[PDB]
Amino acid sequence: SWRHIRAEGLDSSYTVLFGKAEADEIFQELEKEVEYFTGALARVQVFGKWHSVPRKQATYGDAGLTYTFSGLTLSPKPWIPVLERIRDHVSGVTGQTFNFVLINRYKDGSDHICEHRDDERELAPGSPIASVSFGASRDFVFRHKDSRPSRRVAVVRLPLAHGSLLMMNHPTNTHWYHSLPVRKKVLAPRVNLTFRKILL
DNA sequence: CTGTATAACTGCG
DNA sequence: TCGCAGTTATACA
């Protein structure tokens, strides 16, 4: 059972992959195993200013690949068992293959990500992005680029739950921005995995 | 009267 | 507490 998220230029799908017990166990393993970037590899350039990201970021994937956004180039660490497990299961459910994962960890509600598109050149054309979430439920927001205005297109708000999958299909990242806004009342951490296909 | 894009912040309301 | 506007210790097209 998928919840289909559809608006003008919006093709996305939402389902729960794992029940609480399995998702807790996976979350616990991710906390133990995932190594996040620090220092120089945790700073981005936006509107002429360099900033430390208000979260932690990690990349894992096939060797030779890189991911660049906002003046920050992230190189992938080799795959680890917990990530291959999540990847293989997602690939089974969707029929899609992934060679890269960007991991975002929001320690609480003050950690967030500003709105953006996954529009980078090293992303394979038309390829989906698989967004898997563990830990605290957080509100995810889809916003149309012509509404931020020429178009009065309504915003799409959606909670991403523990053990859930959000499939972001083409042309979502062409027309729609997304963000995880600050939620002050959230005190627990959240780990999000966006599986991607990267051009060699 | 008129270039677009901008993964973050501040300065508001 | 939340959300919007503007923005540029800029970079193109």
Q: What is the DSSP string of A130-187?
A: EEEEEES-EEEEEEETTT-----PPPEEEEE-TTEEEEE-TTHHHHEEEEE---TT--
Q: Which of A74, A137, A120 is nearest to A101 (CA)?
A: A74
Under DSSP, the state recorded for A39 is G
In Å, what is the separation between the CA of A155 and the C1' of C13? 30
- Nearest nucleotide relative to A115: CA against C1': B7
Domain A1-200 has CATH 1.10.3720.10: no
Obtained via which technique?
Answer: X-ray
Task: Determine the Cα–Cα distance for residues A55 and A53; give it in Å rounded to an integer.
Answer: 5
CB count within 10 Å of CB A171 equals 11
Strand B footprint, Cβ within 7 Å:
A 44, 46-47, 49, 51, 53-54, 69-70, 102, 112-120
Contact A97, A151 (CB under 8 A): no
Q: Residue A38: in which H helix or E strand, if any?
A: none
Measure Cα distances from A113 to A90, A104, A119, A140, A181 in Å. Answer: 23, 9, 16, 10, 7
- Nearest nucleotide relative to A54: CA against C1': B8
DSSP reduced 3-state for A23: helix
Listed by start position, the domains of chain A span 1-200
Q: Which residues pair with A135 in a beta bridge?
A: A190
Who's near A12: CB < 8 A, 6+ residues apart? A4, A5, A6, A142, A166, A167, A168, A169, A172
Q: How many CA atoms lie within 13 A of A103 on its CB side?
A: 27
In Å, what resolution does this model reach? Answer: 2.3
Binding-site residue numbers of A for Fe cation are 116, 118, 178
